[PDB]
Symmetry: D2
Subunit: 121 residues, 4 copies
C-alpha cells in the first residue's frame, strides 16, 4: 500500500510507489482541503462552480484530485476509487496531481492525504 | 460488498447489508454532492465553515457522511475509511447518515454514493 | 490471519483465533506429513486406501485435516479451501482436527502447518 | 483469479492467466490425486518415498505440483502458497507442472485442481 500527501501548488504532482499493471484492482481514498486561489478550500472533488479555463483534466472540477498511470492522460480520482480496474492499455507508476490550469498553480494552497492499495483479484 | 445511495434528506439514515464483526477490516469510499439547505453542494467531508447547531455527529462537519455500527454513537466516514478497524466492542449493522441537525433534514438535497467492502485480514 | 501446527495426536483439535461469521470468505492452506499409526506418513488429504473404522469425519480420508465451525459437524479441509463460504447458519470459532477414530489418537505422529485468513468480500 | 486442472501426463504443463508482477502477493490452493506411473496415487506434495531419477524440480518430491514464473527455475507449490511473494523478484506468466522425469509423462494419470489469486498488498 502507499500513503502520502499531494500539494495543490505542485504542478508536476507526486509519484507514488504503486506500479499499476494490467488486471490490477486498486482502491484509493483521498481526504483533506485545498484551494486553487480563493480563501475557501474544497475537498478532493474540487469546486463544482468554477469554469474550465484549460484544466489538465476536463472530466473533473477545478481543485479535484486526478492521476496519471505511467504516461497516460489525466484520470479523475476525486474522493477515490473502490476496487477499480483501469482501461485496457494503461500501465505504470501512479502520479497524483491537483486539477488546475497549467501555469496557475503558484497561488494554490493546502493538500490531500491519499491512501492507495492493490486489492484481491 | 454493499453499494448504494445515502440521501441527504433521509434523517433515519440508510441501513446497509454490512454487519461489522470484531476484527473486521473494512474500506468505505463515498462520492457525490449534497446540501443541508443551500444551492451550493458539498462533498462527503461537508462544509468546514458551518457552525455546529446540534449535529448528530459533533466530530464531523455539517453535511459530512457519518455512520453508526450497531449500538455505537455516530462515527465520521467523510470521503471514506481505508482498511479501517472499529474501536473495541463496536459491532453490528452499518447505517450511513448525512450529518445535519435533527428536525432540519426536510430542506436537504442530493446524495452520496457509498461502497463498503470487507478487506483481507 | 492465523498460523499454527495441528498435531495428529491432538484428539481435542487446535482452537484457532478465527471466528467464522455469516458471509465471511476464508482461505486455508495446509501442508506437511502425519500418520494415524503406521511408519508411513500422508499429507492433508490423508490415506485414500484406509477404510473408515469410525472417523470423526466420514467425508474425508483417515489422516485428512478437517475442521468444525463453532459446534458444526466436521467439515473436510484437506489441502485447504480457496475463498470459501460456509453453509447457511454455520458460524463460530474454527477448530482444526486430524481425522482419526476417537480413542485412537495416542499412536499418531507428525503435524500439519496451517494458515487461515479472511478474504476480501 | 485462475481456476484450472494440471494433468499429471502433460509434460509441457498448464500456462495460467496469472502474470506474476513485482510486489504481487498470491495464494494457490491445489487438491486432488495423481500418479507418475503406479496404480497408487499421491496428493500435491507427491511421493515422499520416491527417489529423484531426474525430476524437473529437484526440491520437491516426485508427483508434486511445481510452477515456473516467467524465466524462473521450477518452484515447489505442493498443497499451495498462502499470501506468498516470489523470491528473487521473478515475474511473468505462471505455468503449473506435475513433477516427473522428462520423457516419462506418458504413463501418468490423474490431475490436481488448482486455484490461484492475487491478494491485497
Ligand atoms: N446545520 C444546520 C441547519 C440549520 C438550520 C436549518 C437547516 O436546514 C440546517 O441544516
Ligand atoms: N520418477 C520417475 C519415473 C521413472 C521411471 C518411469 C516413470 O514413468 C517415472 O515417472
Ligand atoms: Ca491556481
Ligand atoms: Ca437542513
Ligand atoms: Ca491412530
Ligand atoms: Ca511417469
Amino acid at each position: 500500500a502507499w500513503k502520502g500527501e499531494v500539494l495543490a501548488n505542485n504542478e508536476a504532482g507526486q509519484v507514488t510507489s504503486i506500479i499499476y499493471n494490467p488486471g490490477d484492482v486498486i482502491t484509493i481514498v483521498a481526504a483533506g482541503w485545498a484551494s486553487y486561489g480563493p480563501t475557501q478550500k474544497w475537498g478532493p472533488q474540487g469546486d463544482r462552480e468554477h469554469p474550465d479555463q484549460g484544466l489538465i483534466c476536463h472530466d473533473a472540477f477545478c481543485g479535484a484530485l486526478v492521476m496519471k498511470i505511467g504516461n497516460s492522460g489525466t484520470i479523475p480520482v476525486n474522493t477515490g476509487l473502490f476496487r477499480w480496474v483501469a482501461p485496457n492499455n494503461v500501465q505504470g507508476a501512479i502520479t497524483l496531481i491537483y486539477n488546475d490550469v497549467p501555469g496557475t498553480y503558484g497561488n494554490n494552497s493546502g493538500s490531500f492525504s491519499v491512501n492507495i492499495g492493490k486489492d484481491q483479484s
